[PDB]
């Protein structure tokens, strides 16, 4: 399971400032892996936090606590 290259291409291109900007094929595959890691880190840190406070599920409260450090690491 993971992101499709085409999805990742569209996501990046939405945000480039200059219409000349392009992305190599190699780079694009790396970005696919990096986006996956980001999501899994978010999910795994969410779980740890829920475990730590003994909740029944990862709710948004638990997520919100782990985001600041998440964003720093990425």
């Amino acid at each position: 399971s993971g992101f499709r290259k085409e999805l990742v291409s569209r996501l990046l291109h939405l945000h480039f400032k200059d219409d000349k900007t392009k992305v190599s094929g190699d780079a694009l595959q790396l970005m696919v892996e990096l986006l996956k890691v980001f999501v899994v880190e978010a999910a795994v840190r969410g779980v740890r936090q829920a475990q730590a406070e003994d909740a029944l599920r990862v709710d948004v409260d638990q997520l919100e606590k782990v985001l600041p450090q998440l964003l720093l690491d990425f």
Binding site: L11, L30, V39, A43, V60
Partner: protein, 93 residues
Amino acid sequence: SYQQRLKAAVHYTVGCLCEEVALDKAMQFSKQTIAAISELTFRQCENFAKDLEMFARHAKRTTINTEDVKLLARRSNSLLKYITDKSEEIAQA
């Protein structure tokens, strides 16, 4: 709608990724949590994109390469090793 469509595609992949972690860790995610991570991931792409674009242009290039991308992962040393090891596999392809 174009961006709504891209947001839905991300949400679906995020839902898949979260389901896999949830099973692996025997812990449930609220649907609001999965939705939040989806929104987070979509926004995070903006930052990735612009950064990559600036890093390429800093090296006087208009097409982003694997060095620009590894620079992006410079932040944590563990993230650095994971993106460099992932870039060795991809190179062997």
